[PDB]
Scaffold this active site. Sequence first.
Site, PDB file in Angstrom:
ATOM      1  CE1 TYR A 122     100.528 113.595  14.584  1.00 36.03           C
ATOM      2  CE2 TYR A 122      98.569 114.751  13.926  1.00 36.03           C
ATOM      3  CZ  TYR A 122      99.236 113.719  14.377  1.00 36.03           C
ATOM      4  OH  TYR A 122      98.446 112.683  14.927  1.00 36.03           O
TER       5      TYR A 122
ATOM      6  CE  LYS B  58     114.933 111.995  21.034  1.00 36.89           C
ATOM      7  NZ  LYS B  58     115.095 110.958  22.295  1.00 36.89           N
TER       8      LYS B  58
ATOM      9  CG  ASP C  47     113.348 109.223  25.143  1.00 36.96           C
ATOM     10  OD1 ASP C  47     113.297 110.137  25.973  1.00 36.96           O
ATOM     11  OD2 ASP C  47     114.155 108.661  24.674  1.00 36.96           O
TER      12      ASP C  47
ATOM     13  CG  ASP D 223      98.438 112.045  18.055  1.00 38.07           C
ATOM     14  OD1 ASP D 223      97.308 111.669  18.621  1.00 38.07           O
ATOM     15  OD2 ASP D 223      98.579 111.056  16.868  1.00 38.07           O
TER      16      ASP D 223
END
Lengths: 414, 414
Positions: free
Chosen positions: B158, B228, B281, B305
């Site tokens: 980011y 992740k 996820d 985010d």
Amino acid sequence: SKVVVPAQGKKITLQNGKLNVPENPIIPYIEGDGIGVDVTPAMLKVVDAAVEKAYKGERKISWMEIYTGEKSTQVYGQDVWLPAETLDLIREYRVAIKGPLTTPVGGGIRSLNVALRQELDLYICLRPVRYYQGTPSPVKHPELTDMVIFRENSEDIYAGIEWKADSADAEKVIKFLREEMGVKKIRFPEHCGIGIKPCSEEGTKRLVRAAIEYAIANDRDSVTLVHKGNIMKFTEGAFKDWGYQLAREEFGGELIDGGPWLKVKNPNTGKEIVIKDVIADAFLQQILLRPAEYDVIACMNLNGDYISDALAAQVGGIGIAPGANIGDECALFEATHGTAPKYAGQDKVNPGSIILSAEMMLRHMGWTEAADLIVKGMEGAINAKTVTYDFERLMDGAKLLKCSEFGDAIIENM
Amino acid sequence: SKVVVPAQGKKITLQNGKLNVPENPIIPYIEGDGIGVDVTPAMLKVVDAAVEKAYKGERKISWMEIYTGEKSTQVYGQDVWLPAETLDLIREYRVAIKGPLTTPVGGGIRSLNVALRQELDLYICLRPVRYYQGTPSPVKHPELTDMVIFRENSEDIYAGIEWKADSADAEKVIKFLREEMGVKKIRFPEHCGIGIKPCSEEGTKRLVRAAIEYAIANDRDSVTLVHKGNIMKFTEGAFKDWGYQLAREEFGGELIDGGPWLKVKNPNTGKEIVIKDVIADAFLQQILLRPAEYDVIACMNLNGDYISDALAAQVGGIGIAPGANIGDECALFEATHGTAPKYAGQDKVNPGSIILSAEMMLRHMGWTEAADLIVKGMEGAINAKTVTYDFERLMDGAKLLKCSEFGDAIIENM
Ligand SMILES: NC(=O)c1ccc[n+]([C@@H]2O[C@H](COP(=O)([O-])OP(=O)(O)OC[C@H]3O[C@@H](n4cnc5c(N)ncnc54)[C@H](OP(=O)(O)O)[C@@H]3O)[C@@H](O)[C@H]2O)c1
Ligand SMILES: NC(=O)c1ccc[n+]([C@@H]2O[C@H](COP(=O)([O-])OP(=O)(O)OC[C@H]3O[C@@H](n4cnc5c(N)ncnc54)[C@H](OP(=O)(O)O)[C@@H]3O)[C@@H](O)[C@H]2O)c1
């Protein structure tokens, strides 16, 4: 060495970009770790019944088991998690399917699923997500969701290119970034892990190219490029620009209004397909709030993992979501849920995911009648509320079924 | 040069890691592009009423407008989107708030929001998400969601470190990766964009350090490290390992069962706080399916985010989600929704987000009575179904309010 090629059976071939499937095709299948021992047998029986019923005995699949994961180590030895032979077998027989796979931790081994995708260059991850009436869902209107996810399958940060903090390589890369590329934005350069996020133009356009052809062949309403391009301009943003550009270059995309959306005319139905785009974090909101506005989705590897997994949860299909890994030469269909070791071997697990992936596999083979029967069977079984424990525990009035019994219910509803 | 320091008013100072807030503090505020012209005035009036009511006239904020975004170009000139003076003003007065901001496209300018965060080193992005009774929501049980997101705010992909495909720099980086680092996994090296994803140990531990202190000071039940890490082991995965390690090193974390969760005892209530982790996820699925199991979240920049934006949508608070950017020396609270140019200036927009961010700001200032009144006002106004068009259009029996009138409703419900 330990795989047995089926005596009766014949290899699928690829000719002119088109599969040539024999009536007696050999299909390679991987049982899968954990509940793969439960759902794969149900999937074999359900697919055979659909094939027997659709073609009255004229067609029949010659399953052939091959190996990956735990069973591979018990078949080939200590650290054989993914034998070269399994990759060769999938490339020789073109089409295969597998249950859930888990990658061992502590040995520096990276995802077996991703290894299969990348080494067979299956750059399409295809996740169709739509609501089966009768499924217990966390949202009010799950029936508004009917999307198809085209997830880019070999490139993005998902590709596994990275160095460990404090290793000589990470400090070598960070030194190159700061001193030769002039990077000043690494807040803390020491003890810092580094990952690379690649995204090429050819990889983008063959993934969006497949998505738009899919919208055309299935007459759907639109293709939405999902990205995080306002922060990552040269990977996510480029993915979005290349996607629009492809639509203009190869599908006659025309500008809607003042842009940026395009419209592509469906050569076969005349339907104007809308090409548009949404920024990924807003998209996770839109699939909840305005789900009917979306249809075919095209996005990169990591976003595609998130988006598929959020959609599946919101239609209550976390355990029946179908999935396929497709390339230009090979295809690997797969259960998309975990290995659920806690219930493995108890004939409990929901076989719906790998069975719907088999449905995709048959349809990819051109056997659409058999595929239609499986959809029809899932339809009726779930609508009849004869389902496995992961459905039944969330609802009243359902009849609890083992994994194998749900497979029978699907056959009974064909 | 064009900012006017308030005649009456006094600067907040930082002493011993603790804010010293005067009864007449000067607070800098940025109107914001688009509907910022609508919601900021409502927010000023609502905060002043809460302060007047809580302290009976003994306290009062001396607002001071400073600039960023469009209004900055109209105040300072052509391409002054973020004047150095605004950064100095926020560091001098310690605490500030701003409406929505949009970054111009076509000039190579990267996110103004992220620029503020990174140059003030506001490494905490704090998004509290919980359901206001009466809010129209897409899910069945929104009231089960009550989480607090600690989103890492300066490092991850980011951070805006990247080269454009075909540029000399991208090809220089790719050449270094392939030839000096031996990278073979870049599927298509030509026409390929490159992004870097950094994650350090100090950045991880000061973000998780804040999350666990927050769980302690607010007696919440757990901290979940979301990552992740099974694909990105040295950034996402390291974030997760460093987070556990911090819990052991500084908060006496003890192993639950056979691990990996920990438990931290709350020094003040004795409550055992659970430290655990979920892969990102699957987490997007779990916040739908088992929302009550989660509380404080700690994660990296991009995942934060997504997660904040998915949670806000699922409680129907996409337009009233509060947000703060907090560092060790400064703090910038913000509306978290877009600029909504279509309705700007029409006194339509929902001021709930920037007003709840003001609520956070007051509470960060130690003015918790005034902050409590604003929560109470939002409570009653929304429960009374006297709301703006983005709420009212989704529901029956509500009374439609302008933006300014909703601000009054909030005051009326204090
Ligand atoms: N795409 C994939 O094939 C894929 C993706 C990720 C992970 N996996 C792998 O799976 C492993 C299994 O172990 P885990 O415990 O770590 O998993 P986990 O994903 O965190 O947990 C999955 C849970 O979902 C339920 N579930 C999973 N598959 C289901 C199915 N087919 N039908 C009905 N319910 C199903 C079970 O929950 P209930 O007990 O509540 O029913 C289950 O234990 C992981 O380590 C991982 O490598 C496979
Ligand atoms: N965190 C932030 O501050 C932040 C994050 C991202 C973007 N933005 C910026 O905002 C710009 C505005 O323009 P866009 O059209 O491009 O936005 P967009 O985010 O794609 O659209 C936002 C839509 O949400 C609704 N909405 C937004 N704020 C609201 C509020 N406070 N109360 C009620 N409803 C609200 C309006 O939808 P309805 O018309 O349906 O009500 C609105 O047009 C963007 O270009 C962007 O840079 C700010």
